Amino acid sequence: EKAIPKDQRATTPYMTKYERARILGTRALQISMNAPVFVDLEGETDPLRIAMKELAEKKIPLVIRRYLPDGSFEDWSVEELIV
Amino acid sequence: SLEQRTLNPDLFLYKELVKAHLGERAASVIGMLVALGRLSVRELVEKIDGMDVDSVKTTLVSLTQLRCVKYLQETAISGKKTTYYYYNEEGIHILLYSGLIIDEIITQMRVNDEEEHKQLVAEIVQNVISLGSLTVEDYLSSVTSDSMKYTISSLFVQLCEMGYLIQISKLHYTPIEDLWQFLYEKHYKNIPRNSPLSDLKKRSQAKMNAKTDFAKIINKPNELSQILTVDPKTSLRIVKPTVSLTINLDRFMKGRRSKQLINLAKTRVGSVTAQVYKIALRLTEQKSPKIRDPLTQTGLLQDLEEAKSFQDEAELVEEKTPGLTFNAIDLARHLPSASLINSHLKILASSNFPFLNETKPGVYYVPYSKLMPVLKSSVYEYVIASTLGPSAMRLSRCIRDNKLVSEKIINSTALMKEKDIRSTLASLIRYNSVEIQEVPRTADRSASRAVFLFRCKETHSYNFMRQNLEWNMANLLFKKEKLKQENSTLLKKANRDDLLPSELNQLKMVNERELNVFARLSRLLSLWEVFQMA
Amino acid sequence: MKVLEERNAFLSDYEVLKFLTDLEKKHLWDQKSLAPELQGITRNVVNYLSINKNFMSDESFAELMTKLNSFKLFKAEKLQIVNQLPANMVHLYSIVEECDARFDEKTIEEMLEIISGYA
Amino acid sequence: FILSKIADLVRIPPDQFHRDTISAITHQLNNKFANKIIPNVGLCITIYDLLTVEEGQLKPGDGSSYINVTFRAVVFKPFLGEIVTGWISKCTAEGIKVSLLGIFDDIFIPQNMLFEGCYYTPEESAWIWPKLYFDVNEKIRFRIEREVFVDVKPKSEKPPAYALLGSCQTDGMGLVSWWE
Amino acid sequence: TEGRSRDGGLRLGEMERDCVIAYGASQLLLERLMISSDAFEVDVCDKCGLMGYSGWCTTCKSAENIIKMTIPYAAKLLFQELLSMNIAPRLRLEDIFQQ
Amino acid sequence: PVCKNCHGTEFERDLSNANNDLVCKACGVVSEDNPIVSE
Amino acid sequence: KEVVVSETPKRIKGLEFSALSAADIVAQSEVEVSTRDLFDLEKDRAPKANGALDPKMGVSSSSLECATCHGNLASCHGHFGHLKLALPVFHIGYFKATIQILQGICKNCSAILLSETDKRQFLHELRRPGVDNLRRMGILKKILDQCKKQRRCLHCGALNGVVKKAAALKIIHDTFRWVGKKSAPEKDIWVGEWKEVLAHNPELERYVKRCMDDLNPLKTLNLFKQIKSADCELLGIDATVPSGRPETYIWRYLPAPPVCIRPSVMMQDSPASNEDDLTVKLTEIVWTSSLIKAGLDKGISINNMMEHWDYLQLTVAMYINSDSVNPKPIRGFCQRLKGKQGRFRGNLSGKRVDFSGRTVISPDPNLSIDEVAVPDRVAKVLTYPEKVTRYNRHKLQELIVNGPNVHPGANYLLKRNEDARRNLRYGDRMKLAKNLQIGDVVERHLEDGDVVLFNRQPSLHRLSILSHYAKIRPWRTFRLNECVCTPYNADFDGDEMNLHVPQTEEARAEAINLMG
Amino acid sequence: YKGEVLGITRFGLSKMRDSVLQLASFEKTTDHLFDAAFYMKKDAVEGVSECIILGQTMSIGTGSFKVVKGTNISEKDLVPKRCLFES
Amino acid sequence: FPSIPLPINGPITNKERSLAVKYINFGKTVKDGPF
Ligand SMILES: [Zn+2]
Ligand SMILES: [Zn+2]
Ligand SMILES: [Zn+2]
Ligand SMILES: [Zn+2]
């Protein structure tokens, strides 16, 4: 019922259809709250479109904590996922 | 005080009375027991919140010693033993009645006058039950080595062998229904297979054997032949010193019952016969019919062929008991004249109140099975005549002998003006002394085409006001400890010296007002206790 | 908001200056830019206790604490008498009780020159 | 000048993501805990250190980073018998308004441990003495016995949150220039 | 308010609430049923949990245990007229963090 | 009736953009939007 | 203050229901409504003395002020009022459940109709950890079957038959189940009283087999209040709460709802206000209860008041559920939570929403799929909140100086310190353009690139809604690309569809990647 | 899945799921409310159709997981400033 | 606010003011006891 290290990792390594709506969903709100982005932008607007460009280089500074249904953790850094 | 006056039964009395003079940690545990009935300690823990598992057991053993609860054990066949815990109805009455135990000892024991244990025999009653259970060796080991201990030790055989100091055991300490359980199947397994005929009569074999034993098991504490030690040296009569004993309320409740009857005597006869009636009753106080009647408490009270048998034999006990049927020749010496004790007792047979009513010529005895319902019918009516108008006393008695009266004949039987009774009768609808019977003239209970009949309904009419006094017993002592919550900075100082001039007055004004409480608690205690004669 | 424990340990009044001296460092040239709210309170602490100390190294502070706490167990008040009226013995008489009937030795003269040597 | 092991969670605005974590969690806790009183503890001054810090969580409606942490800070609790030399700024006819100048001024300390000639004389004096007078803006020595903490707001000045008790029972009390 | 001359505003219906839920979406469903339409600010108590006004509990008159949230106006108004008959929606509250 | 910064007394109901708001001519701070009509 | 204030954001783990007590009503109410009449003849604008549209209970208009909390309509969350009934009545919601609570218990001594060694077996089946609602009421079916099959009680030996409805809304108990042995101590007393009244007015013998003792709402409260708390859990209700006693399930006090629930609508055909249905139901019960309370004090006929006490029993059971009229029907509480879009479909499941629009559709091939075309006259109404950042500061300054008459402009802005809004058609714009603090939010119009939802209104399946990009054209109608028409099953014959636009940023991202 | 085949009627929905805000959102409304508080029931809000009207973050779909920020720190600078406690 | 008291509202007599002594010292016995 606690953190689960890299060895006993028993779920999918795959960045599912509902992840890229949430991670991109929560990143653009950070951009709109003046959090600095890392990527080489040119002249852009529209804090969503600057997010989904920056996803392509996989430089999101986040990590997803999936729950097992028994109330147990399972963690995956957003660079370790593949699409 | 609307928070409390609404959603509180007798539990509002039981919770605060152990909160009055005992630790607060135990007031909440028996509040859980009375609310939820019966439960073990293992799952007691999650019902309350904030008391640890061992901390319950320390709190429960603190409450065990005063005999305020009653445990009972049953085991599972594949499992271990489990111990349930109930609530004791009469053990918590002891610290309720604790002031009045003191004043009866002096009044029952008038053989001594200006004794040097006037302080001490009132302390001994406070020394037998305040610590809980008590034995002989525990008070001779005090600071007094002798100080005439042989007088004080032999003082108690005069005080115990008259009764109400019975050796404690498990019998009265375990509940009666569960006591009635495990003796029922034992006699049911005394009769095995191959007695085939009348299987619905074979249940009576254990059932008749239960009643013979259940009287004998309750007589084992009443058996006084095993609490004596006739010591051949230095003594003549003494109790067994290895005996644990406490108070027994059974004589006290009967003694309080005899205290109630003499007040009814002084109302219906003058001063000369009231002194006569008190003397003969004191001789038979120590052995009387039981007031609680544990046989009618639980059992097969369902069917009328046995429910009538709980008073057929119980009446036959009363007149055919050798220990009370007095011959009216003993009474002339006990007063501090065979013609006068006939003459003053002659009018006890004449009056329609059935005390000393029926007898064999030459012997006399007072009945109880046909008396105390007239006592219950006596204290009920005059209280209504006190709390509202005496016209309401008139309407109550009109419905007594005349059953189910309508609104025309009340003007024919009684006679007052027509507009004033409705401003009095409706007050008696609100307190459930009179009831409504409806007769439909048309279909579907149409309210206009109907007249409305009445009834006394003798059983609901007491049970309303008994809880109207149990809450009233519970309401005024809430203002006792709440009064102690304010002015608390100086009672801690007044418990520390063992002296500011202006502060001493506000210690007196909080003193005579609580002095009024215990007097006002005692007066309605007598108006309540008559409703326990069930 | 949970307070786990209140009185874990003590902290000497030198670090009330010392740790706050480093807080006076990285605060954009305090006290000398005359030619938020947290600044004004945190300068009112550092000046008040320093004037009492005036009107130094931490090593020489440390060994005079070792000589002082010669008590059996009731020592803990050695932490509070560090800067409270130095060079005064009638001051020290009213601080700790029951020492006028216990310190009748050459200790209470030896403790005076340590406190005045601190001054 | 004592430490208190306390735990609380603290928010982080997203524009402080560029600055490092320890200074950011210090900054947002400073103006929360600068010049504040603590219920039933005392007066917190400044965060001392950071013991252990967990992983940063996110509320989905807000989108910022919210973090919980355990840390102790400095808090001024002398003793119930502490000798101290404060100053004064006010004089009243039933007691004396002695409070430390510089930090806080919500203090009323009585005189219930002194002699039998103590009252008020409205001639810029305390009373007439049976002896050098004392006045504003000078070191005045007084001790501490108790404190009172209440945190109740009866919604419908004498701020009662942090008030000390003081007395002047021995000699030399009232002015530090009577000794030394 | 319904009606073009009543200056309109569209009814997002009940099977349209069924149409979104199959997409697995869990954020724009909340804003379009609380935030864009019917947002309302409620301060509610912790112990004996029913609503209170600006700064009280008005059933335990202590005004201490107050925790601010936000709920739709159609959820507040259920929690009052359902309290008008003798059933009580007692609220109980947990915090989000330290799962 | 009185604005919050310039304390103007005249409020003009603009009705062109289906908002039906309340705002003064002086500075441009709205008083109360989302009008409550009694149906 | 110099004091710390700290709170964590919180959540709701789950609701638990309860009937609030007969003492908590005055605890949470603060006014009282003893009097009757709604509008005083003072000829004031808001004439309300005590028991009416009370100005310190609430306010049902825009020009008045709530004298309790404060404020006119933006702030007042309403306050409850309480009443005081003359003598109790039944609850119509619990009326099904107020007879299950009586069939288990004795009609004389008020004990449950069980033996001791039997009742201890049952509540064992309550104490095991695995119990859901489906079997918890399953064993409550067996506990009332066992009791009514058992004729006589356990403490006073009294007879106990059956009790049911009287098909009004009163219940009667038949205590008469003789088999072939009429020699009962119940029966002999019943005839023993009855021939006493047959001496006079002897026309009443044809009624006797019909006539039967009743249980009015006064003695049932006195019958419920007698009982002990120990047997409570065996028939459904539990202890350890203040309201857990079973006397609170019939009315003795009733609360008055805050006046925002019953708004005083003015129909504006006359300067008198046509008040809704719900006030005059509560108004007429305080008149009946007042004249009953005066009725027993001066003295009125018992054959008169028993139908006045039948009246408000019938009347208060209409304030909750108006189906019990036993017949222009009055709307009640139960008449608007359920039904054809009263609640739970028309206001709570499916709501009505801001920022929508509705025009008819016409085809267009020349634009791509995912691209819906939006006309410009609707495109400068539907705005979108958008914060200021250094990434887009240089755009918003040029956009805010356009103003809301040319196309690429804004309508409202929020600076950080201000609290309401700023109108852009009024005041100076270019000076307001120059400051633009970086933490602020403006409301630009719809422009080509934002996110628009779009669906047919009769929505067959999950795929009847999907989201598109927008691009603005100077005509008047909605245009879409033709290949997407087959899900919408459009037919261009005069049908119209609506469009939506989200107003966060995290919904702007989720609408594309899941509904594009 | 609950031992016996049962319909999707009122009589059927009363035997599958017992969460009284969802059942009141079904056809007969008040007859599931009064008897709920009469037995003093207790339901957590975990189904979808009661997370709508309370207005919380939904349990399912893309509302299953949570979003956690990296804190870019380790124990290498998490030692206290311990110095000169009592001597 | 409520009328009609019980009939027992009287000045305490010397018959029972000594009986009222026995209550308060009984509570001082047990509460200052072990429990
Ligand atoms: Zn509350
Ligand atoms: Zn203005
Ligand atoms: Zn108000
Ligand atoms: Zn019975």
Coordinates of C-alpha atoms in Angstrom, one line a residue, chain G residues 112-245:
Chain G
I112 CA -41.3 -5.7 21.1
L113 CA -43.2 -8.9 20.4
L114 CA -40.2 -11.3 20.8
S115 CA -38.8 -13.7 23.3
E116 CA -35.4 -13.0 24.8
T117 CA -33.5 -16.0 23.5
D118 CA -35.0 -15.4 20.0
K119 CA -34.2 -11.6 19.7
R120 CA -30.5 -12.2 20.6
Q121 CA -30.2 -14.5 17.5
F122 CA -31.5 -11.8 15.1
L123 CA -29.2 -8.8 15.8
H124 CA -26.2 -11.1 15.5
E125 CA -27.0 -10.9 11.8
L126 CA -26.6 -7.1 12.0
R127 CA -23.1 -7.2 13.6
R128 CA -21.1 -9.1 11.0
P129 CA -19.0 -6.9 8.7
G130 CA -20.4 -8.0 5.4
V131 CA -23.8 -6.4 5.1
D132 CA -25.2 -4.4 2.2
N133 CA -28.5 -2.6 2.0
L134 CA -30.1 -5.5 0.0
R135 CA -30.0 -8.1 2.8
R136 CA -30.1 -5.6 5.7
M137 CA -33.7 -4.9 4.8
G138 CA -34.1 -8.6 3.9
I139 CA -33.8 -9.6 7.5
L140 CA -36.0 -6.7 8.6
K141 CA -38.8 -8.5 6.7
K142 CA -38.5 -11.6 8.9
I143 CA -38.4 -9.6 12.2
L144 CA -42.0 -8.3 11.6
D145 CA -43.3 -11.6 10.4
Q146 CA -42.2 -13.3 13.6
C147 CA -43.8 -10.7 15.9
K148 CA -47.3 -10.5 14.4
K149 CA -47.6 -14.3 14.4
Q150 CA -47.3 -14.1 18.2
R151 CA -50.6 -13.2 19.9
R152 CA -49.8 -12.0 23.5
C153 CA -47.0 -9.9 24.9
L154 CA -44.2 -10.6 27.4
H155 CA -44.4 -8.0 30.2
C156 CA -48.1 -7.5 31.0
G157 CA -49.6 -10.4 29.1
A158 CA -52.0 -8.2 27.2
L159 CA -53.7 -9.2 24.0
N160 CA -52.3 -8.0 20.6
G161 CA -54.0 -8.5 17.3
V162 CA -53.3 -6.6 14.1
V163 CA -53.2 -2.9 13.0
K164 CA -53.6 -1.5 9.5
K165 CA -54.9 1.5 7.6
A166 CA -58.5 2.6 7.6
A167 CA -59.4 2.9 3.9
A168 CA -58.9 9.2 6.2
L169 CA -55.2 8.3 6.6
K170 CA -55.7 7.1 10.2
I171 CA -54.9 3.6 11.3
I172 CA -56.8 1.3 13.6
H173 CA -55.8 -1.8 15.6
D174 CA -58.0 -4.9 15.7
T175 CA -57.3 -6.5 19.1
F176 CA -60.0 -9.1 18.4
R177 CA -58.6 -12.5 17.3
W178 CA -60.7 -15.1 19.1
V179 CA -60.4 -18.6 17.7
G180 CA -63.0 -20.6 19.6
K181 CA -62.2 -19.5 23.2
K182 CA -63.9 -16.2 23.9
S183 CA -63.1 -16.6 27.6
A184 CA -60.3 -14.1 27.6
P185 CA -59.5 -11.4 30.2
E186 CA -59.5 -9.0 27.3
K187 CA -62.9 -9.9 26.0
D188 CA -64.9 -10.0 29.3
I189 CA -63.9 -6.4 30.1
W190 CA -64.8 -5.3 26.6
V191 CA -68.4 -6.4 27.0
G192 CA -68.3 -5.4 30.6
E193 CA -67.8 -1.7 29.8
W194 CA -70.0 -1.7 26.7
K195 CA -73.4 -2.7 28.1
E196 CA -73.1 0.3 30.5
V197 CA -73.4 2.7 27.6
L198 CA -76.2 0.7 26.0
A199 CA -78.5 1.5 28.9
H200 CA -78.8 5.0 27.6
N201 CA -79.3 5.9 23.8
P202 CA -79.7 2.3 22.8
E203 CA -79.8 2.9 19.0
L204 CA -76.1 2.0 18.7
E205 CA -76.0 -1.8 18.6
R206 CA -75.7 -2.1 14.8
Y207 CA -72.3 -0.4 14.9
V208 CA -70.5 -2.5 17.4
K209 CA -68.8 -5.1 15.2
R210 CA -67.6 -2.2 13.1
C211 CA -66.4 -0.1 16.0
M212 CA -62.8 -0.5 17.1
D213 CA -60.2 1.4 19.2
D214 CA -58.1 3.9 17.3
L215 CA -54.6 5.3 17.7
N216 CA -54.7 9.1 17.2
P217 CA -51.5 11.1 16.6
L218 CA -51.5 12.1 20.3
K219 CA -51.4 8.7 22.0
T220 CA -49.0 7.2 19.4
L221 CA -46.4 9.8 20.5
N222 CA -47.1 8.9 24.1
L223 CA -46.7 5.2 23.1
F224 CA -43.5 5.8 21.2
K225 CA -42.0 7.9 24.0
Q226 CA -42.6 5.1 26.6
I227 CA -40.2 2.6 24.9
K228 CA -36.7 1.7 26.0
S229 CA -33.7 2.3 23.7
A230 CA -32.3 -1.2 24.0
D231 CA -34.6 -2.8 21.3
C232 CA -34.2 0.0 18.9
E233 CA -31.7 -1.6 16.5
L234 CA -33.9 -4.7 16.0
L235 CA -36.5 -2.7 14.1
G236 CA -34.3 -0.4 12.1
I237 CA -33.3 2.8 13.9
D238 CA -30.2 3.1 16.0
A239 CA -28.9 5.0 19.1
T240 CA -25.7 7.1 19.6
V241 CA -27.2 10.2 17.8
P242 CA -29.4 12.8 19.4
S243 CA -32.2 12.4 16.8
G244 CA -32.1 8.6 16.9
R245 CA -35.2 8.2 19.1

